[PDB]
Amino acid sequence: AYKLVLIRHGESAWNLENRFSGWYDADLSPAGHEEAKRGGQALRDAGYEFDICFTSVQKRAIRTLWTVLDAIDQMWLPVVRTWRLNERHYGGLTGLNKAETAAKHGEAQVKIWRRSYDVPPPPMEPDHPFYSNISKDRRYADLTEDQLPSCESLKDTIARALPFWNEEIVPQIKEGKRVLIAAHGNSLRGIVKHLEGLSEEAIMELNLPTGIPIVYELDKNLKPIKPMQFLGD
Amino acid sequence: AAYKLVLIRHGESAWNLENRFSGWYDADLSPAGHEEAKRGGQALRDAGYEFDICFTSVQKRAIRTLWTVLDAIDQMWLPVVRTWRLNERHYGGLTGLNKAETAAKHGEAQVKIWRRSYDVPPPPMEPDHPFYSNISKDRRYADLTEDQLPSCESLKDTIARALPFWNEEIVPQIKEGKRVLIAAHGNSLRGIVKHLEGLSEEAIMELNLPTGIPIVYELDKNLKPIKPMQFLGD
Numbered sequence: 001a002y003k004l005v006l007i008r009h010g011e012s013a014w015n016l017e018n019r020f021s022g023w024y025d026a027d028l029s030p031a032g033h034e035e036a037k038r039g040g041q042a043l044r045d046a047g048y049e050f051d052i053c054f055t056s057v058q059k060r061a062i063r064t065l066w067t068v069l070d071a072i073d074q075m076w077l078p079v080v081r082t083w084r085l086n087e088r089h090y091g092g093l094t095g096l097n098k099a100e101t102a103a104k105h106g107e108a109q110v111k112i113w114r115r116s117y118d119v120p121p122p123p124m125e126p127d128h129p130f131y132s133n134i135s136k137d138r139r140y141a142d143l144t145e146d147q148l149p150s151c152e153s154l155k156d157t158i159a160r161a162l163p164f165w166n167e168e169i170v171p172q173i174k175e176g177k178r179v180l181i182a183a184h185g186n187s188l189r190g191i192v193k194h195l196e197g198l199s200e201e202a203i204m205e206l207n208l209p210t211g212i213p214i215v216y217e218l219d220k221n222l223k224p225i226k227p228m229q230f231l232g233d
Numbered sequence: 234a235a236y237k238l239v240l241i242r243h244g245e246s247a248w249n250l251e252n253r254f255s256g257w258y259d260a261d262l263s264p265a266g267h268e269e270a271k272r273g274g275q276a277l278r279d280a281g282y283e284f285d286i287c288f289t290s291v292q293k294r295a296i297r298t299l300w301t302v303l304d305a306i307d308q309m310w311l312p313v314v315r316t317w318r319l320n321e322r323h324y325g326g327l328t329g330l331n332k333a334e335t336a337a338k339h340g341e342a343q344v345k346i347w348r349r350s351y352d353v354p355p356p357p358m359e360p361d362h363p364f365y366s367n368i369s370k371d372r373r374y375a376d377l378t379e380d381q382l383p384s385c386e387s388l389k390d391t392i393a394r395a396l397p398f399w400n401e402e403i404v405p406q407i408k409e410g411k412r413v414l415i416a417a418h419g420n421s422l423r424g425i426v427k428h429l430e431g432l433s434e435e436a437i438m439e440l441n442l443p444t445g446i447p448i449v450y451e452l453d454k455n456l457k458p459i460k461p462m463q464f465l466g467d
């Protein structure tokens with residue numbers, strides 16, 4: 001009867017969550033920060049305790065985790081960060097709003113990318129304003145040329161998140177360690193897809209709420225014994 | 234030089250203000266303490282410091298100081314390792330008492346002696362102490378053996394349990410070329426400084442490390458400083 005909690009960060013600065021923020025290291029907006037505080041407050045009111053926390057290397061998820069740990073008085077917990085829990089890399093679309101994306105690539109192609117599980121957007125090229133900012137960021141300096149994405153389909157995102165789940169998170173859960181994961185929509189999709197054994201179509205329709213603790217009760221085989229629960233009013 | 238090490242004592246706590254002995258009590262930063270840590274971080278940012286790994290205690294005044302620094306230098310993504318071994322000295326029965334209550338109960342003479350002694354501990358925190366359960370039964374210490382969980386510490390005891398972490402967990406990282414940041418407490422950092430500079434018991438007790446100011450060491454490959462520590466800031 002292992003217990004697992006996931007939280008998806010809230011709003012990021014400059015409307016970036018509506019602009020394919022992806023691997024660009026946008027901070028939380030004050031509103032996104034307040035959401036995290038409400039979620040942490042919900043975990044406290046419910047008396048939740050953790051033994052270890054996992055997050056991405058992106059500050060919007062990390063600050064979400066910090067806000068939560070602060071709210072529940074568990075700032076002393078071990079924290080593990082990994083690029084593998086990063087948001088999906090949206091390639092050349094990173095930073096563009098809906099109108100700019102449509103104008104640049106056309107409604108037909110945008111619809112195809114939106115509904116596809118395995119078609120990536122175009123690569124982020126050297127002329128992209130974020131190209132050097134992301135690709136040469138020191139935090140990814142140890143990644144092999146294979147590992148560092150120029151773009152990702154949802155399938156690619158899920159493919160690189162799962163090995164971390166299996167090799168680092170699973171063992172902790174099986175040891176009775178109470179895990180908290182603070183990450184992004186698409187990396188959490190990968191975990192939820194594997195947990196509940198959803199299909200590609202189903203995972204693409206799943207939209208995890210932000211700033212709300214997501215609770216899983218898992219059996220001995222790390223299979224959910226009930227549907228995901230949310231904490232709050 | 235071969236290596237660079239940065240140390241920082243946590244910013245002023247809410248109890249530093251009230252002049253109460255915190256020790257292992259988990260007092261938070263005061264608003265001023267938070268501003269100190271932020272200034273420290275800005276100094277590190279202005280000088281272009283980059284780190285590869287951070288160490289801190291399990292006390293929030295040090296952790297929050299580290300968080301504030303990492304935020305200021307845009308390195309929130311760094312791996313962070315927390316250990317009770319970098320905790321502040323455990324002040325035993327003095328925990329929670331202020332200056333007046335301490336002199337009232339123990340006399341100025343005894344206080345003088347504790348103050349100037351390297352190896353004499355204050356009285357033990359016993360079960361009837363009002364902070365006994367709050368500290369002694371905190372689950373963050375659940376994995377400590379019976380003899381690791383102190384009821385009180387001399388400065389010698391503190392340094393004695395800090396240095397093993399330094400030698401076993403931090404030294405190898407430094408020699409691996411990792412640029413280390415340690416955000417901790419006056420007395421746990423004293424142990425590190427004493428070992429780096431091979432200082433005498435009296436010299437280390439005269440060393441006052443200021444809250445929230447980054448301290449830089451330039452080290453040779455054997456981790457010997459090539460010059461005096463430098464304070465970073467305005």
Ligand SMILES: O=C1c2ccccc2C(=O)c2c1cc(NS(=O)(=O)c1ccc(Cl)cc1)c(O)c2O
Pocket residue numbers: 248249252253254255327331332335344347348355
């Ligand atoms: O009583 C102690 C003391 C007691 C036992 C071990 C170490 C110390 C110690 O190191 C110390 C003390 C007092 C003061 N000055 S004091 O204004 O009386 C004081 C008191 C308590 C606190 Cl929290 C702060 C200041 C100092 O400057 C010290 O370095």
Ligand SMILES: [Cl-]
Pocket residue numbers: 079313
């Ligand atoms: Cl952290």
